[PDB]
Write an enzyme that holds these catalytic residues in place. Structure first.
Site, PDB file in Angstrom:
ATOM      1  CG  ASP E  26      -6.482 -11.924  18.388  1.00 40.01           C
ATOM      2  OD1 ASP E  26      -6.621 -12.121  17.411  1.00 40.01           O
ATOM      3  OD2 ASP E  26      -5.677 -12.887  19.481  1.00 40.01           O
ATOM      4  CD1 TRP E  51     -10.462  -8.870  24.341  1.00 41.59           C
ATOM      5  CD2 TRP E  51     -10.285 -10.949  24.564  1.00 41.59           C
ATOM      6  NE1 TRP E  51     -10.240  -9.417  23.384  1.00 41.59           N
ATOM      7  CE2 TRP E  51     -10.346 -10.963  23.193  1.00 41.59           C
ATOM      8  CE3 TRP E  51      -9.596 -12.488  25.472  1.00 41.59           C
ATOM      9  CZ2 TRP E  51     -10.155 -11.911  22.441  1.00 41.59           C
ATOM     10  CZ3 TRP E  51     -10.042 -13.806  23.986  1.00 41.59           C
ATOM     11  CH2 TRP E  51     -10.547 -13.021  22.573  1.00 41.59           C
ATOM     12  CG  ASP E  70     -11.980 -16.896  23.286  1.00 42.74           C
ATOM     13  OD1 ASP E  70     -12.314 -15.697  22.297  1.00 42.74           O
ATOM     14  OD2 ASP E  70     -10.595 -16.292  24.120  1.00 42.74           O
ATOM     15  CG  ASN E  98      -6.824  -8.274  21.088  1.00 44.53           C
ATOM     16  OD1 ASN E  98      -7.660  -7.714  20.277  1.00 44.53           O
ATOM     17  ND2 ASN E  98      -5.453  -8.171  21.000  1.00 44.53           N
ATOM     18  CG  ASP E  99      -2.141 -10.800  21.539  1.00 48.09           C
ATOM     19  OD1 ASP E  99      -2.352 -10.515  20.065  1.00 48.09           O
ATOM     20  OD2 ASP E  99      -1.294  -9.817  22.124  1.00 48.09           O
ATOM     21  CD1 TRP E 102      -9.339 -12.885  26.384  1.00 43.96           C
ATOM     22  CD2 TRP E 102      -8.741 -13.844  28.170  1.00 43.96           C
ATOM     23  NE1 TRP E 102      -8.723 -11.592  27.043  1.00 43.96           N
ATOM     24  CE2 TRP E 102      -8.286 -12.038  27.957  1.00 43.96           C
ATOM     25  CE3 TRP E 102      -8.815 -14.201  29.370  1.00 43.96           C
ATOM     26  CZ2 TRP E 102      -7.505 -12.277  29.156  1.00 43.96           C
ATOM     27  CZ3 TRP E 102      -8.398 -14.006  30.880  1.00 43.96           C
ATOM     28  CH2 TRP E 102      -7.748 -12.725  31.022  1.00 43.96           C
ATOM     29  CE1 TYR E 113     -11.048 -17.339  19.402  1.00 41.80           C
ATOM     30  CE2 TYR E 113     -10.432 -17.815  17.247  1.00 41.80           C
ATOM     31  CZ  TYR E 113     -11.047 -16.940  18.500  1.00 41.80           C
ATOM     32  OH  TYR E 113     -12.115 -16.172  17.993  1.00 41.80           O
ATOM     33  CB  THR E 116     -14.478 -14.061  19.703  1.00 37.71           C
ATOM     34  OG1 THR E 116     -12.882 -14.539  19.874  1.00 37.71           O
ATOM     35  CG2 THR E 116     -14.362 -12.699  20.609  1.00 37.71           C
TER      36      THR E 116
END
Ligand SMILES: [Cu+2]
Ligand SMILES: [Cu+2]
EC number: 1.4.9.1
Lengths: 375, 106, 125, 375, 125, 106
Positions: E26, E51, E70, E98-99, E102, E113, E116
């Site tokens: 994500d 995740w 991330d 995955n929202d 991480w 973010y 990823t």
């Protein structure tokens, strides 16, 4: 006649007469049951925007700036709207600051900026009820994920941070009274948290679903009536009427037909659940999809009786939509937002036809919010 | 800064764990032995039996003023912490906050 | 269609980059984000100063000077973006330069671009 | 073979052997004469990005976050690159902070963050030389517009703010030595400012152009050789070789032909001027346009001798381009950037053919910067 | 083409949303902004937690768990955006949700973010 | 806070300017009478003869600790400031920093 056309004619006339131009800062009309807010997470951008729109006409009243994955909320009676936001010292890096802001509903001016100690906000894709305002609008409750589950109490009346409530491995917040709200837990049940009188007492309802039954991240809910509507990836829907004394589940309604569920129909999108309070109707976003494509957009909305589970309509949007919600007025509007085209679509809830659209809303608009003040 | 002493930063092989040490297994998303108690100066080994990455972590002020985060472990890997002080140290899994356990040191 | 072709002003849609008072606007049209052709949107701050430009009005054949004052204090609206440069001058001649952020004089010192308004300061002629 | 293809094959193999994945933070290859930076003002967004690209291959090495209309610079010898940026307390509002950052050239880590007193940055669309680094790379010079013209001295060696130099109604900065730079003034001349020994002494060269002759906002310039190349909306080009002792103008060269200028040819875009130092060649963006469409994109680049004024080539881009620049290596690359499609196009300077493109660069990439380190 | 159709993994282009290790990514692919399939771009910080998801590899018929850690400290890359949800679980089951951002465990506390990475934690099977 | 006293916030009509007052005209992007000197307690009127918006402004610390910015004037409008203290007050145009003038008060 168009908006920019009406504006032109308006100005052409002011010009014909004397009428000079005296630039001023506007105020938005008074809040009504037809106003809608479109938060825009913008695909994890460090800053974001929210648009305030008059649903009856599709005209933008104003906007609001927010930081990283902020959470919006709106006092059902329209006395104001707020948000929990996060900023950094250098754009995306350095000293973090989480805070809550309360905006006057007509001037949009920040009448309160309350810092949240130790950056406790759960940084996550935004889901409607992951945060909430007590029904008396005196507090704002948000969730902390790491280092441990916790709910933060923000005092909006005294404009300050109350404290953190320690809670179980549960998520989302659903107030039912000034000091009681519920959360959906990992163990298959709901948690009832009473935070009255400086302390917290936690309880757990009975399990109402199995590990095979996946409750989506987007449950509908009405602070006014207490109705909670929660689907599963298949459209099965567990309801519950939260009271304060506790949660009273109802008989699960399959939103889709065995014939549909037979032909890959499944709910899909972002904010896919809508509950029209005054009417007790439910709206769920759905389309035919693979079982692991639950975040893709949908092109249909199913309406059904929240008491009987009987279908009332199946609206055809005409567009890839990701989120929906409805206005609580007696002749509700159906909001259909597409993050893919950053365009909001507005339909007549009763007929399912599209009345107007409003585009250019950020990078990926995803959350819709309204005021339940009508009645 | 440390009432604990981490031997190695990188996880060790399950095999190198001294077969006479205190061992907290991890599986099915849980620390199989929730509460374990030792003596000041001893060493607890954590062993992950599955692929799901897991680790040991403490909030700030628990194992000292600064928060502590062990490295991650995948299947058949271990991580060791020596507790040099008497006390009750609560811990959790970094990405998995719903995973907790403790080490009572005497 | 041809970005390199001459300006063709209209007076029928204030939200179209080719509306006639926008003959030298840079940014976004305030009407599309809560303000109006001549006013700022709630929460934003009204600059008092700005770059100007004589813009021809097809409806009355006249020409007026427009004071492209900015609405500041917010992140750019991102709605109805436009850019016109009729008689636009280079930066050592600021009064007609539109790459500048004309937020001077806005309440509480707002200096961030949100959108631009197109009020008339009077007749250019 | 593609970038993502080469990557796939690479990983597929690591997998065939034992070779586990040990996630780590990268470092960018060493700076070279083929590296290029793409700042992205993003149409006045409150925060922005800059992309660092290897021009020989079109591969992104890394990125940099900046605030409001920041200004990038790069020490010609590649010892580093910096920027002057602006942030706010609450996204776009509240306490303002202007500052300068210097980034290690391989780790991209901020090795210096120097605050500028009294938010003195000229908030304006970004033009290549509105800011500059002394040739000895010990200072960064930026411009203040309101309340009065001034140049700020930022000490990069001692990592601190020096002072503000009071200057005439002039714009842009063009260093020629550790303590001398020039600015283009409103009066039609250039100002020579010496800021050595704690004081400033200003001088004015003679007027080199009329009020009818509009110098664009995008002049080319070479800190190494001192050559300044400045066009006018028509393509007439006044040069000057800045020395320290003073500016020595050259005989103006018309970049376009009376036959072309006869058929509406005119320069247009953003950063439309490029000067290849080692070769003494000039590149100017141009197309057939209305006289008041000088900011629209152009689809051609003209190359000509800086000494003779004789045309060497007329490259056909194949795209609406807004900015250009070239690499200073002996076999220069021609950079053509389009803010309209957020795509950078790379051509062989000598043949004018497109070799590769790099897209998805922000919302409206506009400034190109390189290191002049080759020779 | 059909956003609602089943995932069809490839192992020929790591920068295509359908590359096989991205079956539950994500955000944005770090390879497109300075990092690599398994590494972070300069200036950014490497989370250590995240995740995961069992993803099938068409090249060897096997299946491996990918730790979608991330790269934080920067504003989202905006390059090679993707979203896949094979076996993706709801938020009360984080290990597969995955929202979530991480970024836990990244140097200097970076929580923003950027992109990823898709490293293998080992064989899922 | 004020060694000056602004009569009206909004510009006045050229006509209402007392035809016996100190007048600084403005045209062609300049204050036509750069330096003007009066007496403590008097009042200077600024009159803009063109459409180009212009005004009088001071940096902070000149006319007091806080910076001051008069309102804008368009063609045939005026703005007045009464200087209540002896001193040399430098000023400029807000959007046009290249426009300066002064008021020597005695
Ligand atoms: Cu774990
Ligand atoms: Cu002026």
């Amino acid at each position: 006649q168009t908006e920019g056309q009406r504006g032109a004619a308006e100005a052409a006339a002011a010009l014909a007469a004397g009428e000079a131009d005296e630039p001023v800062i506007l105020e938005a009309p008074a809040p009504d049951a037809r106003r809608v807010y479109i938060q825009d997470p913008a695909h994890f951008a460090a800053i974001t925007q929210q648009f305030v729109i008059d649903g009856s006409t599709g005209r933008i009243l104003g906007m609001t700036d927010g930081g990283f994955l902020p959470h919006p909320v709106a006092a059902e009676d329209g006395s104001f709207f707020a948000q929990a936001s996060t900023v950094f010292e250098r754009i995306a890096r350095g000293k973090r600051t989480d805070y809550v802001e309360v905006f006057d509903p007509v001037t949009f001016l920040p009448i309160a900026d309350i810092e949240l100690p130790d950056a406790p906000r759960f940084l996550v894709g935004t889901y409607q009820w992951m945060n909430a305002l007590t029904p008396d609008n005196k507090n704002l409750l948000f969730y902390q994920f790491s280092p441990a589950p916790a709910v933060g109490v923000v005092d909006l009346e005294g404009k300050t941070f109350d404290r953190m409530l320690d809670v179980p491995d549960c998520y989302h917040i659903f107030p039912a009274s000034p000091t009681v709200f519920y959360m959906n837990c990992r163990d298959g049940s709901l948690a009832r948290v009473d935070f009255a009188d400086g302390e917290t007492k936690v309880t757990n309802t009975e399990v109402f679903h199995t590990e095979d039954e996946l409750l989506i991240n987007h449950p509908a809910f009405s602070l006014r009536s207490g109705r909670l509507v929660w689907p599963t990836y298949t459209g099965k829907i567990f309801q519950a009427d939260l009271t304060a004394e506790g949660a009273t589940f109802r008989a699960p309604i399959e939103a889709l037909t065995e014939a549909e569920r037979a032909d890959d129909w499944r709910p899909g999108g972002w904010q896919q659940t809508a509950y029209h309070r005054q009417s007790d109707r439910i709206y769920l976003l759905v389309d035919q999809r693979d079982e692991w494509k639950h975040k893709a957009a949908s092109r249909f909305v199913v309406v059904l009786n929240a008491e009987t589970g009987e279908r009332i309509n199946k609206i055809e949007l005409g567009h890839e939509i990701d989120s929906i919600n409805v206005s609580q007025d007696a002749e509700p509007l159906l909001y259909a937002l597409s993050a893919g085209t950053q365009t909001l679509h507005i339909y007549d809830a009763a007929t399912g036809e599209e009345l107007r659209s409003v585009d250019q809303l950020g990078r990926g608009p995803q959350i819709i919010t309204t005021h339940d003040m009508d009645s | 800064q440390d009432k604990i002493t981490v031997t190695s930063e990188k996880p060790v092989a399950a095999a190198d764990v001294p077969a006479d040490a205190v061992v907290v297994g991890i599986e099915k998303m849980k620390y199989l032995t929730p509460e374990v108690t030792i003596k000041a100066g001893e060493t607890v080994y954590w062993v992950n039996g599955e692929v799901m990455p897991h680790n040991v972590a403490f909030k700030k002020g628990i194992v000292g003023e600064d928060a502590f985060r062990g490295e991650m472990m995948t299947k058949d890997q271990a991580y060791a912490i020596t507790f040099n002080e008497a006390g009750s140290y609560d811990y959790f899994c970094t990405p998995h906050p719903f995973m907790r356990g403790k080490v009572i040191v005497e | 269609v041809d970005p390199r072709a001459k300006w063709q002003p209209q007076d029928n849609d204030i939200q179209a980059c080719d509306y006639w008072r926008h003959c030298s606007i840079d940014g976004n049209i305030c009407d599309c984000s809560g303000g109006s052709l001549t006013n700022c949107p709630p929460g934003t701050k009204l600059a008092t100063a700005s770059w100007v430009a004589s813009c021809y009005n097809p409806t009355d054949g006249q020409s007026y000077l427009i004071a492209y004052r900015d609405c500041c204090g917010y992140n750019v609206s991102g709605r109805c973006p436009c850019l016109n440069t009729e008689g636009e001058l280079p930066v050592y001649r600021p009064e007609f330069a539109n790459d500048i952020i004309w937020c001077f004089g806005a309440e509480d010192d707002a200096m961030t671009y949100h959108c631009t308004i197109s009020p008339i300061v009077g007749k250019a002629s």
